[PDB]
Amino acid sequence: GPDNATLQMLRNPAIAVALPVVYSLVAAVSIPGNLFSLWVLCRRMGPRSPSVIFMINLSVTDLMLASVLPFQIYYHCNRHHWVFGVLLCNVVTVAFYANMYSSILTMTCISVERFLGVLYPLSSKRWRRRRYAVAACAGTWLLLLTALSPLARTDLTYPVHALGIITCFDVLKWTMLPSVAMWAVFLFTIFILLFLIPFVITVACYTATILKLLRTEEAHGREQRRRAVGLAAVVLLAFVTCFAPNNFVLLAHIVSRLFYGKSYYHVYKLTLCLSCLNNCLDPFVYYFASREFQLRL
Amino acid sequence: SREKTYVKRLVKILLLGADNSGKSTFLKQMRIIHKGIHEYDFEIKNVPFKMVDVGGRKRWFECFDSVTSILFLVDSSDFNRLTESLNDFETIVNNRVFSNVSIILFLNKTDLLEEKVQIVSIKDYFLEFEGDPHCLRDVQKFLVECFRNKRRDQQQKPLYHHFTTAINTENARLIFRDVKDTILHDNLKQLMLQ
Amino acid sequence: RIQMRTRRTLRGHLAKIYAMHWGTDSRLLVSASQDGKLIIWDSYTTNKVHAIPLRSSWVMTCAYAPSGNYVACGGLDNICSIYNLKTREGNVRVSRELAGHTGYLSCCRFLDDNQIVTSSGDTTCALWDIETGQQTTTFTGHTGDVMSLSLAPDTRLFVSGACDASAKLWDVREGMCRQTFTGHESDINAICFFPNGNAFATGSDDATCRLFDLRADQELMTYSHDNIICGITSVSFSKSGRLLLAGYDDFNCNVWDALKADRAGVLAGHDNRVSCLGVTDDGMAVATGSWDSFLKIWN
Numbered sequence: 180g181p182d183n184a185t186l187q188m189l190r191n192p193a194i195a196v197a198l199p200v201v202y203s204l205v206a207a208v209s210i211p212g213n214l215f216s217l218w219v220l221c222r223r224m225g226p227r228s229p230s231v232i233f234m235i236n237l238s239v240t241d242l243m244l245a246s247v248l249p250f251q252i253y254y255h256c257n258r259h260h261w262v263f264g265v266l267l268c269n270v271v272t273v274a275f276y277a278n279m280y281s282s283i284l285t286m287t288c289i290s291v292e293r294f295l296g297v298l299y300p301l302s303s304k305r306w307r308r309r310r311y312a313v314a315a316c317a318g319t320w321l322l323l324l325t326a327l328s329p330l331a332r333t334d335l336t337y338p339v340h341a342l343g344i345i346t347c348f349d350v351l352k353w354t355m356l357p358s359v360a361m362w363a364v365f366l367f368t369i370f371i372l373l374f375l376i377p378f379v380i381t382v383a384c385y386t387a388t389i390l391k392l393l394r395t396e397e398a399h400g401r402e403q404r405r406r407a408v409g410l411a412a413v414v415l416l417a418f419v420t421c422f423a424p425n426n427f428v429l430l431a432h433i434v435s436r437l438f439y440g441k442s443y444y445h446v447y448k449l450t451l452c453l454s455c456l457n458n459c460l461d462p463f464v465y466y467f468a469s470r471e472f473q474l475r476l
Numbered sequence: 477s478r479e480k481t482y483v484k485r486l487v488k489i490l491l492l493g494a495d496n497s498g499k500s501t502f503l504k505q506m507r508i509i510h511k512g513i514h515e516y517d518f519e520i521k522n523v524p525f526k527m528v529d530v531g532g533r534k535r536w537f538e539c540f541d542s543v544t545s546i547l548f549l550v551d552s553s554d555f556n557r558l559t560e561s562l563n564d565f566e567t568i569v570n571n572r573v574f575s576n577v578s579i580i581l582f583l584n585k586t587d588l589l590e591e592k593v594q595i596v597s598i599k600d601y602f603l604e605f606e607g608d609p610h611c612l613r614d615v616q617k618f619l620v621e622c623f624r625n626k627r628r629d630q631q632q633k634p635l636y637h638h639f640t641t642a643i644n645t646e647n648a649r650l651i652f653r654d655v656k657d658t659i660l661h662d663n664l665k666q667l668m669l670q
Numbered sequence: 671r672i673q674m675r676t677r678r679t680l681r682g683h684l685a686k687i688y689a690m691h692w693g694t695d696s697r698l699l700v701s702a703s704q705d706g707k708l709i710i711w712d713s714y715t716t717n718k719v720h721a722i723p724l725r726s727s728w729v730m731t732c733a734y735a736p737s738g739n740y741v742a743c744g745g746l747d748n749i750c751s752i753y754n755l756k757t758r759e760g761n762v763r764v765s766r767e768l769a770g771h772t773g774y775l776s777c778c779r780f781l782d783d784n785q786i787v788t789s790s791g792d793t794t795c796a797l798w799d800i801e802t803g804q805q806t807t808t809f810t811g812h813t814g815d816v817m818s819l820s821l822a823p824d825t826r827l828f829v830s831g832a833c834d835a836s837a838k839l840w841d842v843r844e845g846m847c848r849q850t851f852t853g854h855e856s857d858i859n860a861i862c863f864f865p866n867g868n869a870f871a872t873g874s875d876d877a878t879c880r881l882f883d884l885r886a887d888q889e890l891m892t893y894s895h896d897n898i899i900c901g902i903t904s905v906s907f908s909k910s911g912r913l914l915l916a917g918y919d920d921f922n923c924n925v926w927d928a929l930k931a932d933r934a935g936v937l938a939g940h941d942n943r944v945s946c947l948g949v950t951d952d953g954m955a956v957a958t959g960s961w962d963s964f965l966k967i968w969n
């Protein structure tokens with residue numbers, strides 16, 4: 180069965196308080212806000228530009244991440260015991276991770292789309308075409324739902340007879356894959372494609388975009404270049420503070436389990452609720468912050 | 477069919493300097509380096525530009541909306557009809573359809589200006605304080621400010637100005653950069669970033 | 671009250687549409703835009719039966735000949751170019767290049783395969799013979815630019831409207847003004863004969879549509895409402911004469927009962943300014959064009 184360190188983690192008092200509280204605050208803010216964001220962003224604005232259709236994907240992604248949080252709140256209020264079906268354990272751990280990466284991949288597309296619309300106003304007009312925004316959204320799901328595929332197929336529940344519970348992704352099996360080497364191949368491929376490429380590309384795109392607006396020397400419209408630098412700087416800081424702590428702690432856990440047997444899962448679980456603050460931040464940081472949206476509000 | 481992916485890339489410029497300006501030599505230099513109304517297609521740095529030489533008139537000239545920039549040429553040296561060129565400019569720059577198009581000025585003939593400034597007073601033609609009449613920098617900033625200050629209640633759109641000799645190649649790079657800057661400040665609104 | 675619905679949408683123009691004209695076959699239409707293509711469409715099937723690249727992009731009017739053998743257009747080029755649809759080789763080509771106006775061409779309409787009548791920003795209108803290629807009769811008397819013209823159903827006379835706010839009637843064979851009318855507070859943008867050939871409607875920047883009768887010699891009716899703070903861009907009757915249709919700056923077309931003066935309906939299928947409207951010779955369908963770059967067909 181599970182190791183002691185796992186049995187200790189599944190009785191931890193900090194996880195049993197922190198995730199239910201933070202999730203409940205995140206779900207209560209981000210469900211109505213992503214549902215008013217869309218109403219306006221989608222039915223009140225129209226998908227006429229590459230920027231609005233990436234923001235429709237983002238708010239749709241977050242809303243679906245926010246709507247599985249009530250299963251997680253219940254599973255952490257009950258002490259790591261899953262009461263629902265085996266099928267619904269598969270559906271919840273997929274709707275959780277497929278969406279939370281979808282947000283990172285979508286925010287990467289809006290960063291490339293602004294690095295383009297600011298740095299190459301004329302030259303990138305070929306790449307500034309709604310059809311290609313739709314293609315990048317479809318490609319995001321297609322990349323996700325292939326890389327995360329195994330979680331849809333295998334039973335993710337686990338009977339833990341020491342504590343008298345059935346866990347839900349909270350423990351896994353070593354037969355899921357043929358060898359330890361195949362766990363390392365699977366997990367570092369999903370890490371590089373779903374986090375580390377999207378992260379480095381997003382940070383670079385904003386840094387070059389902020390520096391371009393600060394170094395610009397025209398006299399007219401300095402009052403509106405600053406508005407742009409403030410909006411960009413807040414978006415960069417919200418992306419880095421939500422996703423970087425969680426995914427670099429995940430890398431250190433995956434490495435520690437594979438090659439040293441040890442664990443940092445409890446730290447990961449605690450940073451995971453910091454990564455869920457995004458669903459609240461997204462609507463304020465992208466939609467509500469801009470005059471074009473504010474004018475229709 | 478595939479014409480949509482060309483018309484989507486296109487920039488439109490309206491060229492409307494007066495008949496005594498360098499316009500005919502400018503269009504000839506542009507055409508070799510790259511009846512009435514004329515319409516010139518060329519490409520700068522792989523962006524297609526369309527430049528319209530309008531006939532030099534009530535609101536059917538509103539078909540000149542979607543112009544990104546208006547290019548105005550003035551012969552800076554001809555002080556006796558500078559006031560006519562400035563009134564012509566005042567009827568363009570204050571029209572409602574041109575509220576969201578940027579303005580580019582070329583002050584042409586500045587190789588004649590640097591001679592005439594040594595020969596005749598500019599203040600003899602105008603009411604405003606002109607400084608000492610024999611200095612280049614003072615006639616330049618005087619003429620630039622006299623055209624610039626002829627705008628009425630200008631916001632959102634920039635106005636740009638440059639000095640132009642007997643004709644040279646770099647004019648296409650100047651209007652490319654002013655168009656690029658006009659489209660950067662438009663893009664900030666489209667990106668929900670303004 | 672009539673609640674018209676979009677029965678077809680036509681995609682192929684790239685910039686704001688500026689004119690369209692149905693054929694006498696009541697099934698094809700020509701259409702024109704600021705991207706400088708005519709497109710000939712089949713309104714039963716959405717087929718682009720022809721596309722014709724124009725010699726100048728600034729097209730402000732286009733027309734279809736009474737036989738369907740030819741089409742025409744003009745604008746800021748001060749010219750009325752004619753194209754032949756029925757060449758033996760099969761490709762469409764220029765039949766004539768009618769030139770001689772001082773101002774931009776604001777409207778043109780065929781009389782048959784051999785004669786065409788026209789209006790200009792220079793205050794004048796003119797009749798042309800397409801085989802000889804010059805003005806056969808010039809019409810003069812407006813104080814400002816002529817915006818639109820309409821033939822009578824028999825082509826014996828035409829009417830035109832101008833920036834002097836006064837509609838005027840011209841005899842095609844005499845070459846002089848027959849009657850002059852007044853009532854608008856601002857420029858007439860659009861004009862249309864009534865189906866009987868004894869009356870015509872008008873539209874203006876004054877936001878009113880108005881009806882005139884050639885035996886009454888005065889306005890018979892005005893169609894208006896208090897909230898219309900904007901101009902009319904285009905006008906025509908339905909074939910029965912009982913419904914009058916018009917397009918307005920605020921993205922919509924309105925329908926009026928020509929005898930009761932009620933706002934009998936509204937068409938609102940566009941999300942940029944309406945520029946043209948027109949009705950089939952069988953009266954079965956209506957077409958509309960706008961700054962969206964899409965035409966819409968209505969019933």
Ligand SMILES: CC(C)=CCC/C(C)=C/CC/C(C)=C/CC/C(C)=C\CSC[C@H](NC(=O)CC[C@H](N)C(=O)O)C(=O)NCC(=O)O
Pocket residue numbers: 180181182185276348349350351352353362366369370373374432433436437442444
């Ligand atoms: C990577 C990415 C970009 C997204 C999402 C995927 C993801 C976060 C996966 C989880 C992280 C890891 C390292 C999971 C699996 C651990 C590995 C490598 C192998 C299985 S460990 C087996 C399991 N122990 C566990 O303790 C379960 C895993 C649990 N998530 C944890 O690490 O405590 C057990 O049952 N032990 C007893 C036995 O079978 O003898």
